[PDB]
Every structure is written in C-alpha cells, then in structure tokens.
Design a protein around this nucleic acid. Structure first.
Length: 282
RNA sequence: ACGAGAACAUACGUUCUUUGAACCAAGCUUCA
C-alpha cells in the first residue's frame, strides 16, 4: 500500500452542487474521472478501465494531511456511550475508539470566494463568484493506493499538469504529487478486525446490498453532475444520479463495489468509481 | 470522460478650488 500526497500550488475548487461553494477535499469519483480523461487524452482508457475494474488499482477518497499526520473522516461508529470534530488522525483510531479521547487542533487552510465578472463591451457586465479553498503552507491531500501500476503513475503525472477539480483552466487546481511509501500506514491497514471502516464513496452491487447493510452506520451521498467531454451528445447533459455511501461509513460485512455506468445515451460511456476501500479496526 | 464547460470585477471620474514669505529694524559708534 502506497500514498499519493498532493501538495497544492494554487487554490482549488471542489464544488458539490455549486460554483460558489467548495469543500476541503475530493473523492474517488473525481480522481477516477480525471484519470479517465487523461487516459482518453493519450488513448489508454481501455487499459485503465480494465485495470480499475479488475482491482489492479484501488484508490480511496483524497483525505487531508497536516505535518506528518494523515487524517481520515470521523468514522460513524454505532457505539452506545466531539460533534464539531470531523477528522481524526488515522493512527489514533484505536485509542479514539478505546475511550473518550483533542490533542491538537485541526487546521488545514480556509475557504475563500473569488469575485469575477463576465465583461461585455456594449452591455453591463455579469458578476459571478467562485468559492475556493486555499491550503496551508505545509498541508495538502493524500490518496491511499495499493499495488501501484505504471499506467496509474503516467496518468497521475499527466493530471499534474492539467488540474484537479473545477475551474481548472481558469486559474485553479494545480498540484504536485509524490508516492512516499510508508511503513506505519501499511501495517495499520494489513491488520484485520471485526469492524471495517469504508474509505471511498462506494456502493455495493444489487446482489450484495442486503449483506452490506447488516450492522451498518452509513450515510448516503448523491454523486452526479454534468458530463465533461466533447464527444458526448453534442450539448451539455447531466449524468445519471448515483447514490453512494459516504467515505466515513463503517460496516460489519465487506463488499467490493463496481465502476457504475452513468452515461448510456452518448457516443462514449461515462463511468463512476464506486469500488470499496476498507480499513479494519476492533 | 472531474457539480462540470464557457466567462477580464469591468466601464465613466483632474488630489482639485482659496491665498504676497509679509510685518518690526541710519553700516553706525570713539579717529586734528
């Protein structure tokens, strides 16, 4: 298991339904879509989808990190006996679970709002506004992968000089990436456990959804939007809405998701990575 | 096949109008 630490050199915009509103981090849907667009840029989207569908690449949602501290979302535990807390460090999960344990503050950056206009010559200009998020100086995001492949690294390097998120051609989203294989996180992931914490925006297939929802504390998340290409349907069109579990969810039974197809009435398919990525705890 | 594509926070706008560096003031005091 390896890491992809994303040190950002620019404001980002990772909107949820907006241009004016943004979140601090992105998801596996967006990174899979970005890598698929970089694959069709260099003609390897048949290879990349065959790698991703056969579980040769498996990446979680991008998660925050401050100095030598990797963070994950606050796992929804259904324990019996920190509402403003949202991110607990991944190494501190055992003694966060063993008792009511806050050691240091969580600061990643702060949100912003860019004020832009759409200038007209002989007409009054149109204001609009882009909500952004600027990271702090020695912070960023990381993505957990395992058994990395040279195609994944080539596509990541091509995505590095293209932009991640929204409004990327208009000033945002540039970053640099690094692998930096760690030893503590891989030992934390290799250990089994009775309860497993989801880490990507997954959705089980229709023959395992009942098995997945047994002793489950989940949160559904609507993950859709408009199709970003040029060869799809000669006008802007919204893909199929897919409701996946949120990345902080916690399950008893394991599952492997699917790369669902959300675009069918077009010249090329549109995919949505809802494969499952788990972390075992006790 | 990234809640995404496209989109200048842009256009018009004199740091400008008043007002004396004036008023007071033996180159003079003792010298065949």
């Amino acid at each position: 298991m390896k890491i992809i630490k994303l040190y950002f050199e620019s404001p980002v915009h990772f909107g949820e339904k907006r241009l004016s509103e943004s979140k601090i981090t992105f998801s596996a849907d967006t990174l899979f879509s970005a890598l698929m667009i970089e694959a069709v840029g260099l003609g390897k989207e048949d290879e990349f989808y065959q790698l991703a569908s056969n579980n040769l690449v498996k990446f979680s949602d991008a998660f925050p990190f401050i100095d030598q501290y990797y963070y994950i979302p606050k796992p929804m535990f259904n324990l019996k006996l920190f509402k403003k807390l949202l991110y607990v460090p991944i190494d501190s999960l055992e003694d966060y679970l063993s008792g009511g344990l806050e050691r240091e503050s969580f600061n990643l950056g702060k949100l912003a709002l860019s004020e832009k206009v759409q200038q007209h010559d002989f007409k009054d200009s149109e204001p609009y506004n882009v909500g952004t998020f600027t990271f702090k100086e020695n912070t960023g995001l990381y993505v957990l992968i395992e058994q990395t492949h040279p195609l994944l690294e080539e596509l990541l390097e091509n995505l590095q000089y293209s932009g991640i998120g929204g409004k990327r051609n208009s000033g945002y989203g540039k970053f640099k990436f690094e692998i930096l294989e760690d030893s503590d996180i891989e030992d934390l992931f290799s250990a089994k456990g009775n309860r497993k914490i989801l880490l990507s925006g997954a959705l089980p297939k229709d023959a395992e959804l009942e098995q997945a929802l047994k002793n489950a504390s989940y949160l559904l998340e609507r993950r859709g939007g408009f199709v970003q290409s040029d060869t799809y349907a000669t006008n802007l069109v919204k893909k199929q809405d897919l409701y996946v579990f949120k990345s902080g969810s916690t399950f008893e039974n394991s599952f492997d998701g699917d790369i669902y197809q959300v675009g069918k009435k077009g010249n090329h398919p549109v995919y949505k990575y809802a494969k499952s990525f788990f972390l075992e705890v006790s």
